[PDB]
Each structure stands twice: as C-alpha cells, then as structure tokens.
C-alpha cells in the first residue's frame, strides 16, 4: 500500500483570553532510553592478513 505521511492528529486549543486549564490528577511513568558505549575492539595483524 502507498499513502502520505500522517504528521499527526490535528488538534485545537481554545485560547479564550481569560481562562486557564489546571491539572487535577497526575501519573508516574517510566521511560526507557538505550545508548551505546563501545564497539568490539578489533585488532588486525600485519603478518597472516
């Protein structure tokens, strides 16, 4: 199948010039980030190659 990229769901916020919205409840979530540190230490030789 072929389509166009959905950049995201189009949202709208009512900026009403005197109103705020305040959170009344919260949540705690754990996010996982993976970062490489090193690669394999490859040593080549003059003889035998």
């Amino acid at each position: 199948i072929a389509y166009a990229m959905s950049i995201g769901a189009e949202s709208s916020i009512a900026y009403s010039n005197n109103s705020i919205a305040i959170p009344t409840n919260f949540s705690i979530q754990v996010t996982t980030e993976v970062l490489p540190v090193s690669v394999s230490k490859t040593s080549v030789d003059c003889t035998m190659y």
């Binding site: 040593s43 030789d45 003059c46 003889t47 035998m48």
Partner: protein, 49 residues
C-alpha cells in the same frame, strides 16, 4: 642462518645496536613497533619468531 633483524644507524653511518627478533619477545616487540625504545603497555606482535 636466515634471520630477520633490525639495524639502527647513526649520523656517521655506523651501526648503533641490533635486535635479532628471532630470540626474545622483547626483540619481536622491537621489530613489530619499528622502534628501539618502547613505551609501557600491551602491544600485539608479528610472527618473526
């Protein structure tokens, strides 16, 4: 006998010192690293023995 050796020379064309890297691991290190003074550490070596 046929042997690989390393020979140094001075400004006068005289031979300073020899290695003969078929006898000692330090000699093989000296022939591998192309030097007569070797810094402290670990070095892979060639197959001159």
């Amino acid at each position: 006998k046929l042997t690989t050796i390393m020979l140094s020379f001075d400004v006068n064309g005289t031979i300073d010192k020899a290695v003969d890297c078929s006898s000692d691991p330090l000699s093989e290190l000296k022939c591998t690293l192309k030097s007569f003074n070797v810094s402290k550490g670990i070095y892979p070596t060639s197959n001159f023995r």
